[PDB]
Amino acid sequence: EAPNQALLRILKETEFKKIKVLGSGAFGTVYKGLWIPEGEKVKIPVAIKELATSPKANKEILDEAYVMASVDNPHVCRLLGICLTSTVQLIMQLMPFGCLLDYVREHKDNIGSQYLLNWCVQIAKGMNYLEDRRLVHRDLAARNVLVKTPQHVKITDFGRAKVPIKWMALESILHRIYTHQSDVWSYGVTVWELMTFGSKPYDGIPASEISSILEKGERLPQPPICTIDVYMIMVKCWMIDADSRPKFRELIIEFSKMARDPQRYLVIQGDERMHLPSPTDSNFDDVVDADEYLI
DSSP states (O other): OOOOOOOOOBOOGGGEEEEEEEEEOSSOEEEEEEEOOTTOOOBEEEEEEEOOOOHHHHHHHHHHHHHHHTOOOTTBOOEEEEEOSSSOEEEEEOOTTOBHHHHHHHHGGGOOHHHHHHHHHHHHHHHHHHHHTTOOOSOOOGGGEEEEETTEEEEOOOTTOOOOGGGOOHHHHHHOOOOHHHHHHHHHHHHHHHHTTSOOTTTTSOTTTHHHHHHHTOOOOOOTTBOHHHHHHHHHHTOSSGGGSOOHHHHHHHHHHHHTSGGGTBOOTTTTSOOOOOSSSOOOOOBOOTTTOOO
């Protein structure tokens, strides 16, 4: 097929500075930082990820860099570049509000119907892009949806393009079959995650029983704030026959219809006087966002 003409940008360690650690997980450490290119008079808010030097880990970090550099979409996280220090560093756009799963858990008292429905559109948009690119996520979940601004989200961790059964489609669990329609099931569970303001799917139930639960015909419950209109969509995403499930171009349209009259589709107590942080009095010297900086 088509040659991948993506540019892999190599950056100097001296061109960027680490401000504070954001997360020190099992894989490595993620820092909040600024990238100050050459004599460009710009400061770009970045997230810098680094890793000991085991040849296996360096291989996985560079396969992740390969995919991340091969994508360009407003609702997909892009890699800015890589720095080849003693330990490889991935430089990417800063997503100040963290992942969507934490955001919905931490801001439930202020998340209105518009935001929830807009996020659903934004996620389907990113996913439909990944589909056009013939790229299957394999790990779509609310934890893998990063937040640029409360009104702009982007898909991440498609460095899978240890198994999360409770987000997996039936063909994925039994036959290890991963398609764009299997990602539609994961999208369904993600929508359920948002609609329940960060609830854990099939909580208490072990991972083994999931396969039988699904095969019997049992699905995730209807979130109280969901009308049968939104729930029917989630239910359609969880069908045995993958061809019967919605396509992401259909999900964009469906949620877009709903986003035009959000209170007809989501019933949130006190949604009208909610409002989340937006460009008003703050939200934000020569600092420019990565989405506005192109060489």
